[PDB]
Design a protein around this ligand. Structure first.
Ligand code: CA
Ligand code: CA
Lengths: 10, 269
């Protein structure tokens, strides 16, 4: 997943 | 007229600029949503690894904003980057929606190592590890790239990946009072902090925007690394990394702030 706008994989 | 964002002043980039240190000749890759052409940016090149988005233009805004913190041009308009003469390369690994795959990010890191980038800015993360991502960070590091990554915006006391990997320098966010921003991830592996609240930078549509996050802190550090590289062209990625940490302004616990607030003046003196 993610921080704010950028996520990548869970 | 040109404005100097509070964060650029806070990290003392103008003092470095006064010594003639602007990041000239240093290649910096921004692994993000792209970088849009902008009157206050000079983009030297790049590549895209996002299927369906062949150009390096930015359909999100995030990459363009990050790029301007590193290298917005020193002129009579807009804002001013930490390293206004750095050579910016747009490596698009995230799409307009802001998401990407580990495969695309790894392709970007390989590109950075294969094409002579000295610094790679990764204002991105995930709460989960990936061996692919780890290998790509390690490979880029072995090829001379300083990988700088955001700690994350969950507010928790552990940091996101890839920042959590040893060979990535992890950057958290401070506010205008040099306090940790409440959203800024901290903990084991945190190297350093930089301004990440109300950061004004370049934005698509030839305009400017103020945004918050560890994504905005990270490019202050990538920019500072470019200043150190210009001053010391023979220095390796790890030497630059440690020097930034050793000259940072201590803020208290290394658990909350790492080595402290990046200081471009101290790092280039
Ligand atoms: Ca400017
Ligand atoms: Ca790390």
């Amino acid at each position: 997943v993610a921080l704010x706008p950028v996520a990548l994989x869970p | 007229a040109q404005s100097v964002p509070w964060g650029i002043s806070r990290v003392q980039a103008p003092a470095a600029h006064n010594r003639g240190l602007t990041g000239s000749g240093v290649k910096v890759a921004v692994l993000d949503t792209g970088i849009s052409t902008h009157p206050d940016l000079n983009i030297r090149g790049g590549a895209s690894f996002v299927p369906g988005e062949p150009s390096t233009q930015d359909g999100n805004g995030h990459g363009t904003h990050v790029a301007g913190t590193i290298a917005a041009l020193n002129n009579s308009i807009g804002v001013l980057g930490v390293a206004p003469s750095a050579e910016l390369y747009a490596v698009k690994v995230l799409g307009a929606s802001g998401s990407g795959s580990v495969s695309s990010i790894a392709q970007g890191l390989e590109w950075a190592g294969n094409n002579g980038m000295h610094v790679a800015n990764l204002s991105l993360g995930s709460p989960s590890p990936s061996a692919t991502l780890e290998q790509a960070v390690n490979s880029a590091t072995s090829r001379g790239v300083l990988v700088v990554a955001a700690s994350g915006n969950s507010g928790a006391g552990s940091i996101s990946y890839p920042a959590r990997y040893a060979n990535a320098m992890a950057v958290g966010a401070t506010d205008q009072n040099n306090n940790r921003a409440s959203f800024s991830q901290y903990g084991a592996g945190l190297d350093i902090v930089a301004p990440g609240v109300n950061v004004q930078s370049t934005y698509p549509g030839s305009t400017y925007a103020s945004l918050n996050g560890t994504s905005m802190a990270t490019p202050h550090v990538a920019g500072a690394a470019a200043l150190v590289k210009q001053k010391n062209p023979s220095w390796s990625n790890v030497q630059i990394r440690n020097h930034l940490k050793n000259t940072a302004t201590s803020l208290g616990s290394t658990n909350l702030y790492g080595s402290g607030l990046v200081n471009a003046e101290a790092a280039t003196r």
